[PDB]
Amino acid sequence: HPTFNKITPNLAEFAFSLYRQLAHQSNSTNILFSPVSIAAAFAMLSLGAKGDTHDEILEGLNFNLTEIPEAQIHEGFQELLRTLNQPDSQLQLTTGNGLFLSEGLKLVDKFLEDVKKLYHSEAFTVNFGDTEEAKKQINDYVEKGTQGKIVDLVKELDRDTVFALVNYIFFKGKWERPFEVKDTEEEDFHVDQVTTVKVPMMKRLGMFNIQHSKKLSSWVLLMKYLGNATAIFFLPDEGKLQHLENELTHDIITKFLENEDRRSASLHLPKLSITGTYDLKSVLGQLGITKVFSNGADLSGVTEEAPLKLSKAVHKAVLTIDEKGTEAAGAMFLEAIPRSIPPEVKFNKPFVFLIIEQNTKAPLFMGRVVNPTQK
Amino acid sequence: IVGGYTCGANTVPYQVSLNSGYHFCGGSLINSQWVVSAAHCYKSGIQVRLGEDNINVVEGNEQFISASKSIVHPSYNSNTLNNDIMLIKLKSAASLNSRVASISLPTSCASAGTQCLISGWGNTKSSGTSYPDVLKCLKAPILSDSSCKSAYPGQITSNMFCAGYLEGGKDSCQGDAGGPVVCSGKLQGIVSWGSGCAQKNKPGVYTKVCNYVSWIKQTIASN
């Protein structure tokens, strides 16, 4: 049973739910999060939950407990996370979890075992008694985990915190067909109709899996990464961002991943270093997952000594995109191009994108770029 | 056109520019009411510009005529560019003169080595972009089938032929598509595609017009 059939369709619906929640709050904020990373982390947490607390989590991740066995869900995430942690992958994607519980708590052995074997994650004990040392400790972990990529992830720890969860992911892929750094220039990026910002714009004339969809009122571009990952970008027509974010479905996205026809185009894609940081308690709470964060939370699977609820949960995503790709600076990258004037498709205004794992088609990342030069 | 020369105003009377707010392809006038071009250049609402030299400034000899019909070859494959040929009927007949004349169709296919003239307002740089104001010209020979197939393995059909120089430096480019390849007063080819422009061992590929003379005459009669 392939990983896809166990969790992808579900991750897609989750991805959309979380995205739309953030997109409904504002049309001018940058967005970046990992559906995979966030869902895996709470699927892992559900292992220590029970009763409605447990059901509410999985049902909150768009998984129907009366259609697919909980074992399939965990086996799926296990397989996917396993592939993403492979030290030898050309993708160079690193993601991890941070489980922090107050020292002195008698932990359930079964729980810690599953978290290690199924989610390749580890638990840690910290004295929340001293809010500052606890904070330094947690950040120290993410600090060592992301090899310095993420510093001071947490900025505030409530006094009665007993359990906090940290989830992060960092990605910077290399294209199969790169851009020549020499061709990158500063260009106008239209944050809105009456405001522009200058941004380094990569550009290349070639054959691209690019086309304009009348259904989404957007140009759609697919770029393959060296490493079994594909980036797909949705450039909505003027004033059609809300339309696009509203029309996206798994079927529509899949339709694009299935078609490989290409056409000539002079592409302009902005170089970017973007991040996303979220309070999962606030976000997941709006998605129906509230009990695991409440006083009546059932986390007896984590500890039987005394009551327990998730006090803090934060997600941090980091994505970098630049010209770097394959090695063959020459005619190797010479494509057969029709000789009419090719369309100049510029990603110079707000757009949506996703990064899809090649084999499982799982949504590693989903975001929106409103202003590439500002947080 | 890369590595070519300025033709000189109206020295290539059969050359036309397809415009949709700007020049995007070339074409050849075969009779007062029909223009031959490339299928991949197809677009709706095309305005055919004849008697042009400096496509940007008014010089006095141009005739702008809308395309009433744009018939793409029924077997045109947009992925392989096989059968890359298109016929455009002018809404009204053009006024033929010394600056605007039709080029005749071939009665037999040209053989390897045949020397011809290729023209257009396409990019003039093998690297980078530079569109000219005036029409550019290039003298170039049709290459052997051997070299063509060798240059583009499994990409060349019997409806295509290469022309140019294997060493590079001289070639048609983006913006020349649809344009003519004339040999001894015969339109033997249409600029179609190529890997890069004026790149070594990567000559231009052209639609073999002689294979469509029958289709052209039949289409003109039925329209």
Short mmCIF file of all heavy atoms in Angstrom, two decimals, chain A residues 197-255, unseen atoms left out:
data_model
loop_
_atom_site.label_atom_id
_atom_site.label_comp_id
_atom_site.label_asym_id
_atom_site.label_seq_id
_atom_site.Cartn_x
_atom_site.Cartn_y
_atom_site.Cartn_z
N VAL A 197 8.10 47.14 -5.06
CA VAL A 197 9.32 47.00 -4.29
C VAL A 197 10.31 46.37 -5.26
O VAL A 197 9.89 45.69 -6.20
CB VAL A 197 9.14 46.06 -3.07
CG1 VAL A 197 8.26 46.73 -2.04
CG2 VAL A 197 8.52 44.75 -3.50
N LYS A 198 11.59 46.61 -5.07
CA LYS A 198 12.59 46.03 -5.96
C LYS A 198 12.99 44.67 -5.42
O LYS A 198 13.14 44.51 -4.22
CB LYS A 198 13.84 46.93 -6.02
CG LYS A 198 13.62 48.30 -6.65
CD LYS A 198 13.38 48.19 -8.14
CE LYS A 198 13.24 49.57 -8.77
NZ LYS A 198 13.06 49.47 -10.25
N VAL A 199 13.13 43.70 -6.30
CA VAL A 199 13.52 42.36 -5.87
C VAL A 199 14.41 41.71 -6.91
O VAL A 199 14.23 41.93 -8.11
CB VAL A 199 12.28 41.45 -5.66
CG1 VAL A 199 11.25 42.15 -4.80
CG2 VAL A 199 11.69 41.07 -7.01
N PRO A 200 15.40 40.92 -6.47
CA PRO A 200 16.27 40.25 -7.44
C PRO A 200 15.39 39.28 -8.22
O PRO A 200 14.70 38.44 -7.64
CB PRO A 200 17.31 39.55 -6.56
CG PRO A 200 16.62 39.39 -5.24
CD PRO A 200 15.85 40.68 -5.09
N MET A 201 15.41 39.41 -9.54
CA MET A 201 14.57 38.59 -10.39
C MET A 201 15.39 37.65 -11.27
O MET A 201 16.14 38.10 -12.13
CB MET A 201 13.70 39.49 -11.28
CG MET A 201 12.49 38.81 -11.91
SD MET A 201 11.22 38.35 -10.70
CE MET A 201 10.22 39.86 -10.62
N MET A 202 15.25 36.36 -11.04
CA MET A 202 15.95 35.38 -11.85
C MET A 202 15.17 35.31 -13.15
O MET A 202 13.96 35.54 -13.17
CB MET A 202 15.94 34.01 -11.17
CG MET A 202 16.32 34.05 -9.70
SD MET A 202 16.42 32.42 -8.95
CE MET A 202 14.65 31.97 -8.90
N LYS A 203 15.85 35.02 -14.25
CA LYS A 203 15.14 34.92 -15.50
C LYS A 203 15.84 34.00 -16.46
O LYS A 203 17.06 33.87 -16.43
CB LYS A 203 14.95 36.31 -16.12
CG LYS A 203 16.20 36.96 -16.64
CD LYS A 203 15.91 38.37 -17.15
CE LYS A 203 15.43 39.27 -16.02
NZ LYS A 203 15.29 40.70 -16.46
N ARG A 204 15.05 33.33 -17.29
CA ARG A 204 15.59 32.43 -18.27
C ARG A 204 14.58 32.16 -19.36
O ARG A 204 13.38 32.07 -19.11
CB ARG A 204 16.00 31.09 -17.63
CG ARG A 204 16.56 30.10 -18.64
CD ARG A 204 17.23 28.91 -17.96
NE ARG A 204 16.28 28.05 -17.25
CZ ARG A 204 15.48 27.17 -17.84
NH1 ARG A 204 15.50 27.02 -19.16
NH2 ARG A 204 14.66 26.42 -17.11
N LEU A 205 15.09 32.07 -20.58
CA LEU A 205 14.29 31.78 -21.75
C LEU A 205 14.47 30.30 -22.02
O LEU A 205 15.60 29.83 -22.21
CB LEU A 205 14.78 32.58 -22.95
CG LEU A 205 14.20 32.16 -24.29
CD1 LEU A 205 12.68 32.32 -24.28
CD2 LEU A 205 14.82 33.00 -25.40
N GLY A 206 13.38 29.55 -22.02
CA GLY A 206 13.47 28.13 -22.26
C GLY A 206 12.11 27.50 -22.40
O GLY A 206 11.12 28.18 -22.67
N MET A 207 12.07 26.19 -22.23
CA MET A 207 10.83 25.44 -22.31
C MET A 207 10.36 25.17 -20.90
O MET A 207 11.05 24.50 -20.13
CB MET A 207 11.06 24.13 -23.06
CG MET A 207 11.46 24.33 -24.51
SD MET A 207 10.23 25.33 -25.42
CE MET A 207 8.92 24.10 -25.64
N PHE A 208 9.20 25.70 -20.55
CA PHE A 208 8.67 25.53 -19.21
C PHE A 208 7.30 24.88 -19.18
O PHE A 208 6.53 24.96 -20.13
CB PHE A 208 8.58 26.89 -18.51
CG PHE A 208 9.92 27.52 -18.24
CD1 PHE A 208 10.44 28.48 -19.12
CD2 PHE A 208 10.67 27.16 -17.12
CE1 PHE A 208 11.68 29.07 -18.87
CE2 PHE A 208 11.91 27.75 -16.87
CZ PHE A 208 12.42 28.71 -17.75
N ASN A 209 7.01 24.21 -18.07
CA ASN A 209 5.73 23.58 -17.85
C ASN A 209 4.97 24.75 -17.26
O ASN A 209 4.85 24.90 -16.04
CB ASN A 209 5.87 22.45 -16.83
CG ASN A 209 4.63 21.61 -16.71
OD1 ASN A 209 4.71 20.43 -16.36
ND2 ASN A 209 3.48 22.21 -16.97
N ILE A 210 4.48 25.61 -18.15
CA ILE A 210 3.78 26.82 -17.74
C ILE A 210 2.60 27.04 -18.66
O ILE A 210 2.66 26.73 -19.85
CB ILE A 210 4.75 28.02 -17.80
CG1 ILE A 210 4.11 29.27 -17.20
CG2 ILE A 210 5.17 28.28 -19.24
CD1 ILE A 210 5.09 30.41 -17.06
N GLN A 211 1.53 27.58 -18.11
CA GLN A 211 0.32 27.79 -18.90
C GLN A 211 -0.65 28.64 -18.12
O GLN A 211 -0.57 28.74 -16.90
CB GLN A 211 -0.34 26.44 -19.21
CG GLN A 211 -0.58 25.55 -17.98
CD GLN A 211 0.62 24.68 -17.63
OE1 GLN A 211 1.31 24.90 -16.62
NE2 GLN A 211 0.88 23.68 -18.46
N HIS A 212 -1.59 29.25 -18.83
CA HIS A 212 -2.58 30.07 -18.17
C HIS A 212 -3.91 29.32 -18.04
O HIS A 212 -4.45 28.83 -19.02
CB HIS A 212 -2.78 31.38 -18.93
CG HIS A 212 -3.72 32.32 -18.25
ND1 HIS A 212 -5.09 32.14 -18.26
CD2 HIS A 212 -3.49 33.42 -17.49
CE1 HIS A 212 -5.66 33.08 -17.52
NE2 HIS A 212 -4.71 33.87 -17.05
N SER A 213 -4.41 29.23 -16.82
CA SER A 213 -5.67 28.55 -16.55
C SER A 213 -6.82 29.54 -16.44
O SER A 213 -6.82 30.42 -15.57
CB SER A 213 -5.56 27.75 -15.25
OG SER A 213 -6.85 27.35 -14.80
N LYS A 214 -7.80 29.41 -17.32
CA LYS A 214 -8.96 30.30 -17.30
C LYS A 214 -9.82 30.00 -16.07
O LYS A 214 -10.48 30.89 -15.53
CB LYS A 214 -9.78 30.14 -18.58
N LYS A 215 -9.78 28.75 -15.63
CA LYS A 215 -10.56 28.31 -14.47
C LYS A 215 -10.07 28.94 -13.17
O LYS A 215 -10.87 29.26 -12.29
CB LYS A 215 -10.50 26.79 -14.37
CG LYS A 215 -11.61 26.15 -13.55
CD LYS A 215 -11.42 26.32 -12.06
CE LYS A 215 -12.60 25.73 -11.30
NZ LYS A 215 -12.84 24.29 -11.66
N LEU A 216 -8.76 29.11 -13.05
CA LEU A 216 -8.18 29.69 -11.84
C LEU A 216 -7.81 31.16 -12.06
O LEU A 216 -7.42 31.85 -11.13
CB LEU A 216 -6.94 28.91 -11.43
CG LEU A 216 -7.16 27.44 -11.04
CD1 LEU A 216 -5.82 26.77 -10.78
CD2 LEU A 216 -8.03 27.38 -9.80
N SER A 217 -7.94 31.62 -13.30
CA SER A 217 -7.59 33.00 -13.64
C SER A 217 -6.15 33.22 -13.20
O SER A 217 -5.82 34.24 -12.60
CB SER A 217 -8.51 33.98 -12.89
OG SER A 217 -9.87 33.61 -13.01
N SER A 218 -5.29 32.25 -13.50
CA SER A 218 -3.89 32.33 -13.10
C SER A 218 -2.93 31.61 -14.03
O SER A 218 -3.29 30.64 -14.70
CB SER A 218 -3.71 31.73 -11.70
OG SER A 218 -4.65 32.23 -10.78
N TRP A 219 -1.70 32.08 -14.06
CA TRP A 219 -0.68 31.39 -14.83
C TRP A 219 -0.20 30.34 -13.82
O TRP A 219 -0.11 30.61 -12.62
CB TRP A 219 0.48 32.33 -15.19
CG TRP A 219 0.24 33.08 -16.46
CD1 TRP A 219 -0.35 34.31 -16.60
CD2 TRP A 219 0.61 32.67 -17.79
NE1 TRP A 219 -0.38 34.68 -17.92
CE2 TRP A 219 0.21 33.70 -18.67
CE3 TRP A 219 1.25 31.53 -18.31
CZ2 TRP A 219 0.43 33.62 -20.05
CZ3 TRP A 219 1.46 31.45 -19.69
CH2 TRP A 219 1.05 32.50 -20.54
N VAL A 220 0.09 29.14 -14.31
CA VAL A 220 0.55 28.07 -13.44
C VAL A 220 1.88 27.55 -13.96
O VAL A 220 2.01 27.17 -15.12
CB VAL A 220 -0.49 26.93 -13.39
CG1 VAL A 220 -0.08 25.89 -12.35
CG2 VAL A 220 -1.87 27.51 -13.04
N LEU A 221 2.88 27.54 -13.08
CA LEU A 221 4.22 27.09 -13.43
C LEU A 221 4.69 25.94 -12.56
O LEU A 221 4.49 25.95 -11.34
CB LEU A 221 5.20 28.24 -13.28
CG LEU A 221 6.69 27.86 -13.26
CD1 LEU A 221 7.13 27.49 -14.68
CD2 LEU A 221 7.52 29.03 -12.72
N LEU A 222 5.30 24.94 -13.18
CA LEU A 222 5.84 23.79 -12.46
C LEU A 222 7.34 23.67 -12.74
O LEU A 222 7.75 23.59 -13.90
CB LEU A 222 5.16 22.48 -12.87
CG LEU A 222 3.76 22.18 -12.34
CD1 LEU A 222 2.74 23.09 -13.00
CD2 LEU A 222 3.44 20.72 -12.64
N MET A 223 8.12 23.65 -11.68
CA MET A 223 9.57 23.56 -11.78
C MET A 223 10.05 22.35 -11.00
O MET A 223 9.79 22.24 -9.79
CB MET A 223 10.21 24.81 -11.17
CG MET A 223 9.77 26.12 -11.78
SD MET A 223 10.93 26.71 -12.99
CE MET A 223 12.21 27.32 -11.92
N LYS A 224 10.74 21.44 -11.67
CA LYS A 224 11.24 20.25 -10.98
C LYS A 224 12.56 20.50 -10.27
O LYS A 224 13.48 21.11 -10.81
CB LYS A 224 11.40 19.08 -11.96
CG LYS A 224 10.08 18.49 -12.43
CD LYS A 224 10.28 17.22 -13.22
CE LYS A 224 8.95 16.61 -13.65
NZ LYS A 224 9.13 15.35 -14.44
N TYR A 225 12.63 20.04 -9.03
CA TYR A 225 13.83 20.17 -8.23
C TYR A 225 14.68 18.95 -8.47
O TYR A 225 14.19 17.88 -8.83
CB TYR A 225 13.50 20.22 -6.74
CG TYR A 225 13.13 21.58 -6.22
CD1 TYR A 225 11.87 21.82 -5.67
CD2 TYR A 225 14.06 22.62 -6.20
CE1 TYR A 225 11.54 23.04 -5.12
CE2 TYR A 225 13.74 23.86 -5.64
CZ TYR A 225 12.49 24.05 -5.10
OH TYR A 225 12.17 25.23 -4.50
N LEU A 226 15.97 19.13 -8.26
CA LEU A 226 16.91 18.03 -8.38
C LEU A 226 16.68 17.38 -7.02
O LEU A 226 16.96 17.99 -5.98
CB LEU A 226 18.33 18.59 -8.48
CG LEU A 226 19.49 17.72 -8.93
CD1 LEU A 226 19.21 17.15 -10.32
CD2 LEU A 226 20.75 18.56 -8.95
N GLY A 227 16.11 16.18 -6.99
CA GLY A 227 15.88 15.55 -5.70
C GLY A 227 14.47 15.06 -5.43
O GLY A 227 14.09 14.87 -4.27
N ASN A 228 13.69 14.86 -6.48
CA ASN A 228 12.33 14.36 -6.33
C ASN A 228 11.39 15.28 -5.55
O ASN A 228 10.83 14.90 -4.53
CB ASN A 228 12.35 12.98 -5.66
CG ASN A 228 13.43 12.08 -6.23
OD1 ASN A 228 13.57 11.96 -7.46
ND2 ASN A 228 14.20 11.44 -5.35
N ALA A 229 11.25 16.50 -6.05
CA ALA A 229 10.36 17.49 -5.46
C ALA A 229 9.98 18.41 -6.61
O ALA A 229 10.76 18.61 -7.54
CB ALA A 229 11.07 18.27 -4.38
N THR A 230 8.78 18.95 -6.55
CA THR A 230 8.31 19.83 -7.60
C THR A 230 7.67 21.05 -6.99
O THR A 230 6.90 20.95 -6.05
CB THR A 230 7.28 19.13 -8.51
OG1 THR A 230 7.95 18.18 -9.35
CG2 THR A 230 6.54 20.15 -9.37
N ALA A 231 7.99 22.20 -7.55
CA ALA A 231 7.42 23.44 -7.08
C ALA A 231 6.38 23.89 -8.10
O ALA A 231 6.62 23.86 -9.31
CB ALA A 231 8.51 24.50 -6.94
N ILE A 232 5.20 24.26 -7.62
CA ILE A 232 4.16 24.71 -8.51
C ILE A 232 3.70 26.08 -8.03
O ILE A 232 3.40 26.27 -6.86
CB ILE A 232 2.99 23.70 -8.55
CG1 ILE A 232 1.83 24.27 -9.36
CG2 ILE A 232 2.57 23.32 -7.14
CD1 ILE A 232 0.80 23.22 -9.77
N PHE A 233 3.68 27.05 -8.94
CA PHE A 233 3.31 28.42 -8.59
C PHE A 233 2.03 28.88 -9.28
O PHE A 233 1.81 28.61 -10.46
CB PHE A 233 4.45 29.37 -8.99
CG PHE A 233 5.79 29.01 -8.40
CD1 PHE A 233 6.59 28.03 -9.00
CD2 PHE A 233 6.29 29.69 -7.30
CE1 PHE A 233 7.86 27.75 -8.51
CE2 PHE A 233 7.56 29.41 -6.79
CZ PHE A 233 8.35 28.44 -7.40
N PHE A 234 1.19 29.58 -8.54
CA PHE A 234 -0.07 30.09 -9.07
C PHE A 234 -0.04 31.62 -9.06
O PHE A 234 -0.07 32.24 -8.00
CB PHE A 234 -1.24 29.58 -8.23
CG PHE A 234 -1.34 28.08 -8.19
CD1 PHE A 234 -0.71 27.36 -7.19
CD2 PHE A 234 -2.03 27.39 -9.18
CE1 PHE A 234 -0.76 25.97 -7.16
CE2 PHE A 234 -2.09 26.00 -9.17
CZ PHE A 234 -1.45 25.29 -8.16
N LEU A 235 0.02 32.21 -10.25
CA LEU A 235 0.05 33.66 -10.40
C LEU A 235 -1.35 34.13 -10.81
O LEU A 235 -1.73 34.08 -11.99
CB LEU A 235 1.07 34.02 -11.48
CG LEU A 235 1.35 35.50 -11.73
CD1 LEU A 235 2.05 36.11 -10.51
CD2 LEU A 235 2.25 35.61 -12.96
N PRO A 236 -2.15 34.59 -9.84
CA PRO A 236 -3.50 35.04 -10.18
C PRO A 236 -3.51 36.33 -10.98
O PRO A 236 -2.62 37.17 -10.83
CB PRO A 236 -4.15 35.21 -8.81
CG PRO A 236 -2.99 35.72 -7.97
CD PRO A 236 -1.82 34.86 -8.43
N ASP A 237 -4.51 36.48 -11.86
CA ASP A 237 -4.65 37.69 -12.65
C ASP A 237 -4.98 38.82 -11.67
O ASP A 237 -5.32 38.55 -10.52
CB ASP A 237 -5.79 37.56 -13.67
CG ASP A 237 -5.53 36.47 -14.71
OD1 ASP A 237 -4.39 36.37 -15.22
OD2 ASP A 237 -6.49 35.73 -15.03
N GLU A 238 -4.89 40.07 -12.13
CA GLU A 238 -5.19 41.21 -11.26
C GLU A 238 -6.50 41.06 -10.51
O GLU A 238 -7.54 40.80 -11.11
CB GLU A 238 -5.22 42.51 -12.06
CG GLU A 238 -3.87 42.92 -12.65
CD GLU A 238 -2.84 43.28 -11.59
OE1 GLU A 238 -3.20 43.36 -10.40
OE2 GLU A 238 -1.67 43.50 -11.97
N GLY A 239 -6.44 41.21 -9.19
CA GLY A 239 -7.63 41.11 -8.36
C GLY A 239 -8.24 39.73 -8.23
O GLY A 239 -9.33 39.61 -7.68
N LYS A 240 -7.55 38.70 -8.70
CA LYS A 240 -8.09 37.34 -8.63
C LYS A 240 -7.42 36.42 -7.61
O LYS A 240 -7.55 35.19 -7.71
CB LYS A 240 -8.05 36.69 -10.01
CG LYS A 240 -9.02 37.30 -11.01
CD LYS A 240 -10.46 37.10 -10.55
CE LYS A 240 -11.44 37.83 -11.46
NZ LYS A 240 -11.26 37.41 -12.87
N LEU A 241 -6.71 36.99 -6.64
CA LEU A 241 -6.05 36.19 -5.63
C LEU A 241 -7.07 35.41 -4.81
O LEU A 241 -6.92 34.20 -4.62
CB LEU A 241 -5.22 37.06 -4.68
CG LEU A 241 -4.67 36.34 -3.43
CD1 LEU A 241 -3.63 35.30 -3.84
CD2 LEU A 241 -4.07 37.36 -2.48
N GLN A 242 -8.09 36.10 -4.32
CA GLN A 242 -9.12 35.44 -3.52
C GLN A 242 -9.83 34.37 -4.34
O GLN A 242 -10.16 33.31 -3.82
CB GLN A 242 -10.13 36.48 -2.99
CG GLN A 242 -9.54 37.49 -1.99
CD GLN A 242 -8.51 38.44 -2.61
OE1 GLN A 242 -8.76 39.05 -3.66
NE2 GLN A 242 -7.35 38.57 -1.97
N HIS A 243 -10.06 34.64 -5.63
CA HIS A 243 -10.70 33.68 -6.52
C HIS A 243 -9.86 32.40 -6.56
O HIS A 243 -10.38 31.30 -6.36
CB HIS A 243 -10.81 34.27 -7.93
CG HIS A 243 -11.21 33.27 -8.98
ND1 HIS A 243 -12.47 32.71 -9.04
CD2 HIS A 243 -10.52 32.74 -10.01
CE1 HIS A 243 -12.53 31.87 -10.06
NE2 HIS A 243 -11.36 31.87 -10.67
N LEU A 244 -8.57 32.56 -6.83
CA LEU A 244 -7.62 31.44 -6.91
C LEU A 244 -7.54 30.62 -5.62
O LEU A 244 -7.60 29.39 -5.66
CB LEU A 244 -6.22 31.96 -7.23
CG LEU A 244 -5.06 31.00 -6.95
CD1 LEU A 244 -5.07 29.85 -7.96
CD2 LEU A 244 -3.74 31.76 -7.02
N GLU A 245 -7.38 31.30 -4.50
CA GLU A 245 -7.27 30.63 -3.21
C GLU A 245 -8.57 29.88 -2.91
O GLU A 245 -8.60 28.93 -2.13
CB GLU A 245 -6.98 31.66 -2.11
CG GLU A 245 -5.77 32.55 -2.39
CD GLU A 245 -5.49 33.56 -1.27
OE1 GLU A 245 -6.43 34.27 -0.85
OE2 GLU A 245 -4.32 33.65 -0.83
N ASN A 246 -9.63 30.30 -3.58
CA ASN A 246 -10.94 29.72 -3.38
C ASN A 246 -11.24 28.55 -4.31
O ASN A 246 -12.01 27.67 -3.95
CB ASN A 246 -12.00 30.81 -3.58
CG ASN A 246 -13.14 30.69 -2.61
OD1 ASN A 246 -13.93 29.74 -2.66
ND2 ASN A 246 -13.24 31.66 -1.70
N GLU A 247 -10.64 28.55 -5.49
CA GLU A 247 -10.87 27.50 -6.48
C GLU A 247 -9.93 26.30 -6.42
O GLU A 247 -10.17 25.29 -7.09
CB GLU A 247 -10.82 28.08 -7.89
CG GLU A 247 -11.88 29.13 -8.18
CD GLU A 247 -13.29 28.60 -8.03
OE1 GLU A 247 -13.60 27.56 -8.66
OE2 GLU A 247 -14.09 29.21 -7.29
N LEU A 248 -8.85 26.41 -5.65
CA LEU A 248 -7.89 25.32 -5.54
C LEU A 248 -8.47 24.06 -4.90
O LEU A 248 -9.13 24.11 -3.86
CB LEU A 248 -6.66 25.77 -4.75
CG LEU A 248 -5.66 26.64 -5.51
CD1 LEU A 248 -4.64 27.22 -4.54
CD2 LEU A 248 -4.96 25.82 -6.58
N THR A 249 -8.22 22.94 -5.56
CA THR A 249 -8.69 21.64 -5.09
C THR A 249 -7.56 20.67 -5.38
O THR A 249 -6.67 20.97 -6.19
CB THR A 249 -9.93 21.14 -5.86
OG1 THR A 249 -9.58 20.92 -7.23
CG2 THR A 249 -11.07 22.17 -5.79
N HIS A 250 -7.61 19.51 -4.74
CA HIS A 250 -6.62 18.47 -4.94
C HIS A 250 -6.67 18.02 -6.40
O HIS A 250 -5.64 17.82 -7.05
CB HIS A 250 -6.91 17.29 -4.01
CG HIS A 250 -6.07 16.09 -4.29
ND1 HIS A 250 -4.71 16.05 -4.07
CD2 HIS A 250 -6.39 14.89 -4.84
CE1 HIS A 250 -4.23 14.89 -4.48
NE2 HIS A 250 -5.23 14.17 -4.96
N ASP A 251 -7.89 17.87 -6.93
CA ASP A 251 -8.05 17.44 -8.32
C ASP A 251 -7.40 18.44 -9.29
O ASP A 251 -6.68 18.04 -10.20
CB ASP A 251 -9.54 17.26 -8.64
CG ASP A 251 -9.78 16.58 -9.98
OD1 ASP A 251 -9.84 15.33 -10.01
OD2 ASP A 251 -9.88 17.28 -11.02
N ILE A 252 -7.64 19.73 -9.08
CA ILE A 252 -7.04 20.73 -9.97
C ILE A 252 -5.52 20.72 -9.90
O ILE A 252 -4.84 20.75 -10.92
CB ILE A 252 -7.57 22.14 -9.64
CG1 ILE A 252 -9.01 22.27 -10.15
CG2 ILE A 252 -6.67 23.20 -10.28
CD1 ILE A 252 -9.61 23.63 -9.96
N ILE A 253 -4.98 20.67 -8.69
CA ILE A 253 -3.54 20.65 -8.53
C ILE A 253 -2.97 19.38 -9.18
O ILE A 253 -1.97 19.44 -9.91
CB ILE A 253 -3.16 20.72 -7.03
CG1 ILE A 253 -3.51 22.10 -6.49
CG2 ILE A 253 -1.67 20.40 -6.85
CD1 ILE A 253 -3.16 22.33 -5.03
N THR A 254 -3.63 18.25 -8.94
CA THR A 254 -3.21 16.98 -9.51
C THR A 254 -3.20 17.05 -11.04
O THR A 254 -2.28 16.54 -11.69
CB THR A 254 -4.13 15.82 -9.06
OG1 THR A 254 -4.09 15.70 -7.64
CG2 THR A 254 -3.70 14.51 -9.68
N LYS A 255 -4.21 17.68 -11.61
CA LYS A 255 -4.27 17.81 -13.06
C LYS A 255 -2.97 18.42 -13.59
O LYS A 255 -2.43 17.98 -14.61
CB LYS A 255 -5.47 18.67 -13.48
CG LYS A 255 -5.41 19.21 -14.91
CD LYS A 255 -4.62 20.53 -14.97
CE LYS A 255 -4.69 21.20 -16.33
NZ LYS A 255 -4.08 20.38 -17.41
#
